Design a protein around this ligand. Structure first.
Ligand SMILES: *[C@@H]1O[C@H](CO)[C@@H](O[C@@H]2O[C@H](CO)[C@@H](O)[C@H](O)[C@H]2NC(C)=O)[C@H](O)[C@H]1NC(C)=O
Ligand SMILES: CC(=O)N[C@@H]1[C@@H](O)[C@H](O)[C@@H](CO)O[C@H]1O
Ligand SMILES: O=C(O)Cc1c[nH]c2ccccc12
Ligand SMILES: [Fe+3]
Ligand SMILES: [Zn+2]
Ligand SMILES: [Zn+2]
Length: 341
């Protein structure tokens, strides 16, 4: 009766979803697609109920009538009088990161460098950076700005995919899911960290979580914060402790979307599910933790304290906010009123 079907993007998210399915006694079951767009389509058709989405994809979904239900909330110091579910979301900081050893590389000398993006169409990895670049460049030729990138979801044979490495067999180069090595917040940072690219467009937290022994991953275990720098828009370079004053934009938190006709039901199940598997849920860490996966951010970002309700029942434009929505529209005219499917 009250059963929810989650959409997992790619083989690893399917594996996590299945565990979750099992531990929930089929209160949640799983559907799989190779890309976030495919999962959006599955939701429209009614074959899936929900997935957690980056702001860039909430924009897509939004045009097709899908709606934000619940947002991720991470560790905060302000709003400490309030419980997590009821506490408003801050927004994450979009940053540009570089090696310190790579002296003299600033925001103004990025043309023809090698870039690492989370995936085409994501907030911190794509829409913020390339929105700014098109702006400053007065040109829609963003495919020709960098010498080489890894931008999962771009044409595998374009220079936007040249730096992507596919999976362990080298198959699936540039797929916009975690089979791709340099995919997402951790993939894009790893891409910089191994000096495949010169710059990585991630969020503030990605640097903190994958340096100073925070990640046990073989590529990251020796990584040290002092070896990185943030590129500011004013042409300067700051340590990674200055994010508050050296970021490209503040971004709306990843959120769970569903078809409006399903939103109420999806919300109800999710709140009960996190009671069970959230930050101090009954069965976490004993049996299963919804917000854990070894720094792989599967289904959810690993730093999610809880999923929060949304005051003022916002629409998707209200949720993303006007400044962000205009930026995406302006960028989309480079390559108005219609669902993309
Ligand atoms: C950058 O992200 C980090 C990590 O998400 C933020 O810092 C942490 O914040 C909480 C509360 O302030 C602390 O209790 C944690 O222990 C911190 N984590 C780590 C790993 O240092 C930081 O606030 C963010 N900064 C900006 C500018 O957004
Ligand atoms: C593991 C799990 O989620 N089991 C639930 C149970 O707690 C609940 O009484 C019912 C209605 O929500 O659905 C089932
Ligand atoms: O809560 C968020 O993270 C997103 C958000 C909702 N309304 C906004 C208005 C301006 C900027 C960001 C947001
Ligand atoms: Fe994001
Ligand atoms: Zn700012
Ligand atoms: Zn409203």
């Amino acid at each position: 009766y009250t059963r929810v079907v989650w959409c997992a993007v790619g083989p690893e998210e399917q594996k996590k979803c299945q565990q979750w399915s099992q531990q929930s006694g089929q209160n949640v079951t799983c559907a799989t697609a190779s890309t976030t767009d495919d999962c959006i389509v599955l939701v429209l058709k009614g074959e899936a109920d929900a997935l957690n989405l980056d702001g860039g994809y909430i924009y897509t979904a939004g045009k097709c009538g899908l709606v934000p239900v619940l947002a991720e909330n991470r560790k905060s110091s302000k709003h400490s009088s309030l419980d997590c579910v009821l506490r408003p979301t801050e927004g994450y900081l979009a940053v540009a990161v570089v090696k310190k050893a790579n002296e003299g590389l600033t925001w103004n000398s990025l043309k023809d460098k090698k870039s690492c993006h989370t995936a085409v169409d994501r907030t911190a990895g794509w829409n913020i950076p390339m929105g700014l670049i098109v702006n400053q460049t007065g040109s829609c030729a963003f495919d020709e700005f960098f010498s080489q990138s890894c931008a999962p979801g771009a044409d595998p044979k374009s220079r936007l995919c040249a730096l992507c490495a596919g999976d362990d067999q080298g198959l699936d180069k540039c797929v916009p899911n975690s089979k791709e090595k340099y995919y997402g917040y951790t993939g894009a940072f790893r891409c910089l960290a191994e000096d495949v690219g010169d710059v990585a467009f991630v969020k503030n937290d990605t640097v903190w979580e994958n340096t100073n022994g925070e990640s046990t991953a073989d590529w990251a275990k020796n990584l040290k914060r002092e070896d990185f720098r943030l590129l500011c828009l004013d042409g300067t370079r700051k340590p990674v402790t200055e994010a508050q004053s050296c970021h490209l934009a503040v971004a709306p938190n990843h959120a769970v979307v569903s078809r409006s006709d399903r939103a109420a039901h999806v919300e109800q199940v999710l709140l009960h599910q996190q009671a069970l598997f959230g930050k101090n849920g009954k069965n976490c860490p004993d049996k299963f933790c919804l917000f854990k996966s070894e720094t792989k951010n599967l289904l959810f970002n690993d730093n999610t304290e809880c999923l929060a309700k949304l005051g003022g029942r916002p629409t998707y434009e209200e949720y993303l906010g006007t400044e962000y929505v205009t930026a995406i529209a302006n960028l989309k005219k480079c390559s108005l009123e219609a669902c993309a499917f």
